[PDB]
Amino acid sequence: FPATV
Amino acid sequence: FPATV
Amino acid sequence: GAMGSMERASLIQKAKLAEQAERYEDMAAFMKGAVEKGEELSCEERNLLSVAYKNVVGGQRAAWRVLSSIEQKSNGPEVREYREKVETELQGVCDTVLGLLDSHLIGDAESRVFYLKMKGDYYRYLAEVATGDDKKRIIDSARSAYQEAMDISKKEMPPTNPIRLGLALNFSVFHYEIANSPEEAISLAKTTFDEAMADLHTLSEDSYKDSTLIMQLLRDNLTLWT
Amino acid sequence: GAMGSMERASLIQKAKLAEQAERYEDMAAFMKGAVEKGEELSCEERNLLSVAYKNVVGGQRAAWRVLSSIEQKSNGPEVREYREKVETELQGVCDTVLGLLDSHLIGDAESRVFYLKMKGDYYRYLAEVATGDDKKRIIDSARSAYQEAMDISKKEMPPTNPIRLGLALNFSVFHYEIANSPEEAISLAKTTFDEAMADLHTLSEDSYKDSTLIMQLLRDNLTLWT
Ligand SMILES: O=C(C1=C(O)C(=O)N(c2ccc(O)c(C(=O)O)c2)[C@@H]1c1ccc2c(c1)COC2=O)c1ccccc1
Ligand SMILES: O=C(C1=C(O)C(=O)N(c2ccc(O)c(C(=O)O)c2)[C@@H]1c1ccc2c(c1)COC2=O)c1ccccc1
Ligand SMILES: [Mg+2]
Ligand SMILES: [Mg+2]
Description:
The complex is a heterotetramer, with 2 copies of chain A and 2 copies of chain C.
Chain A: no helix or strand
Chain C: H1 8-20, H2 24-35, H3 43-73, H4 78-105, H5 109-127, H6 133-156, H7 162-179, H8 182-198, H9 208-225
Helix pairs in contact in C: 1-2, 2-3, 3-4, 3-5, 4-5, 5-6, 5-7, 6-7, 7-8, 7-9, 8-9
């Protein structure tokens, strides 16, 4: 899954 | 630490 | 409130005690109480709040996804019922935060971007589980919150700034996984990484390690999308 | 109770859904409700219960220890207060289980050893945080529960049996870390491992993998103690 912060 | 189950 | 008798400073301490014990529910509760003492939060304090609630919703999102994929494959009502129970619980935590933003938190530029990015993130988390009439009301909100934060960051922070960078990463992910707009999602991420390296001389000693990481994460996402 | 309207079988399903989502509080609650339907638990069902509550108390014990060592090093009252809050929470979960054992669970030999071992374990967990008059009442209890379970297992199960083996491992740890009796602690563990390999021909296809592991854990502890 794509990275978020 | 010692192992327990 | 249950934290209402405690001193703000003792609440900050215990939030930090909770983070060490990895008790993020407690951590979030402590920080919700500190916010409710009505004072501005410091940069260190903003990030105690964000880390605590992010760890909370993160476990819920992960449990929701486990159950939801079971519920997909399975199509007894017990799977639906348990999924809905974890869902309702997750929705409440997002409301608690969006309420905490829209009542005490939403100053200086980094401070305003920080909270507007949180608003867009937790609207996005609700979007992940919403459906129907009520749903699309949620998507537009995540988008306004993000856009406003983009506008501010683009004008007031250098393109190497961690808040500007991390916000854009998430706004990209929003385009991809939430608005079926891989075009915008990829454009933002590439532009963001590009503009940051164009002005790479603007990194500061205090945050350069963080900026390098968010740039690496922007290219991680880009590798994954192409 | 909150699970009182649900079917036992739907409670078992959701306990299993919760384990997959790693939602062990939910898991424990579901299994507490199933127990309270008043029927015997199957072997599979016993271990859904044990795994759920063990994961619950395990996180609490770990948080307690983080805070307690901070509290030791530190010798403001906030550390004591947060430690006591996590402590009280942990004590409640042990009471909930000890109550669940002393009211519905405490049949066949493996079944009786299983629950008596749980009784000794959760008395031991309370012993880890107790002090004073109230304290030593707790140590003797963990010991009776264990002893009775030892007596049964020694007579009714072969020395390769996982329940007999795992119980003895924990009873050893109890001697070491709770009764300041390294002598007995080491004796039990060595004897247990020895007697099991003496009659190694008694492993069964259904559980041999488990027995090998508890034997490896018995020797892991022994390496650590000498
Ligand atoms: O934990 C991290 C950091 C610290 O806790 C911290 O204080 N940061 C930081 C640095 C400069 C700042 O100006 C501020 C601020 O104004 O509040 C915060 C990192 C960080 C925190 C949150 C976000 C980002 C960066 C980007 O978007 C975000 O939401 C972290 C670092 C890299 C990647 C992900 C997380
Ligand atoms: O998860 C494990 C297992 C399963 O869940 C399971 O069903 N087992 C099992 C095998 C034979 C049995 O007769 C029974 C029973 O009568 O209830 C249960 C393993 C197991 C569970 C709990 C304990 C032990 C063994 C020893 O003491 C214990 O408390 C596990 C395996 C190895 C080490 C630690 C844990
Ligand atoms: Mg942080
Ligand atoms: Mg198990």
